[PDB]
Design a protein around this ligand. Structure first.
Ligand code: HEM
Ligand code: HEM
Ligand code: HEM
Ligand code: HEM
Lengths: 140, 146, 146, 140
């Protein structure tokens, strides 16, 4: 992530403000509907629209991303605990992280008409890819 | 491709609101900016060094109307995407040498553009329907690669 | 799936030399070792901490004969893989909750096992034919996911 | 790559010995036949079996890998020049590196009956993944 990418990310994520958790749930819903195979990881969840479990999980995901933004110059350490968790317990196949990243970009695009410029779009894609790389770094 | 009546109507309805020229250029431009390596097929388009340069390039806009126009006529034949794009598939493989993976990247960028353009109207169910369509088109375009 | 007569005979011929039990356990074991996260579906198999532990585990071997046995009967129906695996597809989705990506990983490990087992006899053309088969089987198994 | 991965890689690649170039051509042939789409990057090559262009390219690929093994504790710098090349000129889509890696593992499996143990198989897969990551690091 170039310094410019770091600036666009913080600007865009700032605008998200308190809507983060809500955007996190929307992205999950978008993922479950567009890519049905991702549902295999949540057989224990009520995956109906407006589900409390989805909203709750949505906020956890959103909170982690917010933590990543605040520590973009040191994500591996900032997400160390989550990296261990997905690698040793959850064990979600790596391919799935690109599906959620895509749904998160779609969600941001739908809510940030003015901030989602081609440049910002590019920086956010790199940012989520970096996050996904960190979360799967301890798999093998 | 097989789409439920609900998904069918959802796609058709939203597309009636699409400015083919603008959306096509917008999507192609974002492709070149977000995934720079796709620029390998457009060396003859000129200056593509910056986002501004890419989005304001006349050749990108012209081509924009071109591919999306073909994409558009495709929505009128959802029952037979393979048959509809057979010739274009042969063209992108034998003459243009375009890696099919690119069709998928463009399909996703198109989805981002639609969401950016329509906002809240681009609901999760609407997105799901379009993700099926673009995947169907990408597969139809890669069908005759050998 | 559509295979040329050449690819058909190549697959059939090599498979007559396969020890289903051994190959099945070998492939499943290498899957669990090379892609550790796939172990999430086999917590009830016991000790899978080391390669030796994985390759010498009785439950892995038993299951090995099981999936490859089904895979084997599938080779007798290359003209209709979807129809042949419909029930198993529903099972892996609704009851087992197996991410379809896993079928592709297992398909590639299977190819590595065959090459390791047959050496020079596993020529490039033979591999290409088998890559088509495993991809066809993986798609047939993911067909009823919803 | 754990130190153990580094040991397995060097042991396996040592056995390859002078056959490296020859194995590199075989892997390319295996790739072009199994994954036809990869041919879109070599429209200027005679891709028929035993082609001089394929054998020659096979050796270059093999030589680079040998360089990566000899400098596994510093690949980014060791492959800096190739990273720039694929990122700025060749521009091969990242997905394609997994296809070649797979064909290289198949090639090694077919030639190293005794050395291709489950453990070695695992280390070689991680190694090629690391190589692919390095070669695409400068794309965006
Ligand atoms: C940007 C990527 C992602 C981030 C930042 C992320 C973050 C998190 C966080 C913070 C938790 C909460 C853990 C806890 O309860 O302590 C979690 C749980 C989990 N994640 Fe990830 N995750 C990501 C991607 C994925 C993907 C792609 C999937 C699979 C499709 C996934 C599946 C899960 C599951 C199933 C859980 C546990 C759910 C439960 O509590 O029952 N995650 N993730
Ligand atoms: C669903 C998506 C796509 C559709 C429907 C499509 C359609 C078309 C059409 C209608 C043409 C004009 C053919 C002619 O010159 O007679 C064309 C040309 C071309 N397409 Fe595609 N295309 C798609 C995606 C792509 C992608 C992703 C790339 C690569 C990044 C690409 C690269 C090209 C190039 C380089 C040409 C030649 C342009 C020229 O000669 O002026 N296309 N495409
Ligand atoms: C082409 C590949 C595959 C075939 C043909 C296949 C076939 C089968 C068959 C025949 C069964 C037995 C069903 C029954 O209990 O009645 C089964 C069970 C199962 N499969 Fe698959 N399978 C494949 C791949 C996978 C993969 C990649 C995984 C996940 C890593 C997987 C995980 C399971 C599990 C956990 C069971 C249940 C075992 C038990 O209850 O004892 N399968 N599979
Ligand atoms: C382990 C991964 C790979 C390695 C180590 C590698 C290495 C190399 C090397 C050393 C060269 C020679 C450059 C020169 O002539 O100075 C090269 C060229 C090239 N590579 Fe990569 N490469 C890898 C993967 C790929 C993949 C996946 C493709 C595409 C399917 C690819 C396509 C090319 C092309 C087309 C050239 C130029 C061929 C020519 O000279 O006409 N490479 N690569």
């Amino acid at each position: 992530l170039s310094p410019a990418d770091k600036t666009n990310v913080k600007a865009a994520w700032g605008k998200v403000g308190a809507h983060a958790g809500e955007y996190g749930a929307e992205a999950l819903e978008r993922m479950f509907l567009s890519f049905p195979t991702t549902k295999t990881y949540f057989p224990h969840f009520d995956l109906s629209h407006g589900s409390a479990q989805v909203k709750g999980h949505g906020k956890k995901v959103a909170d982690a991303l917010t933590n990543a933004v605040a520590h973009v110059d040191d994500m591996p350490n900032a997400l160390s605990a989550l990296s261990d968790l997905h690698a040793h317990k959850l064990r979600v196949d790596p391919v799935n992280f690109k599906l959620l990243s895509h749904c998160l970009l779609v969600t941001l695009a739908a809510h940030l008409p003015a901030e989602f410029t081609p440049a910002v779009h590019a920086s956010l894609d790199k940012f989520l890819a970096s996050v996904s790389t960190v979360l799967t770094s301890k798999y093998r | 491709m097989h789409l439920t009546p609900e998904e069918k109507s959802a796609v058709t309805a939203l597309w009636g609101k699409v400015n083919v020229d603008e959306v096509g250029g917008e999507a192609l431009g974002r492709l070149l900016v977000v995934y720079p390596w796709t620029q390998r097929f457009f060396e003859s388009f000129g200056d593509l060094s910056t986002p501004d340069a890419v989005m304001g390039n006349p050749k990108v806009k012209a081509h924009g109307k071109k591919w999306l126009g073909a994409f558009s006529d495709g929505l009128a034949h959802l029952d037979n995407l393979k048959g509809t794009f057979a010739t274009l598939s042969e063209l992108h493989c034998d003459k243009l040498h375009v890696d099919p993976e690119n069709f998928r990247l463009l399909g996703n960028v198109l989805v981002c553009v639609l969401a950016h353009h329509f906002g809240k109207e681009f609901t999760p169910p609407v997105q799901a329907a379009y993700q099926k369509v673009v995947a169907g088109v990408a597969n139809a375009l890669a069908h005759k690669y050998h």
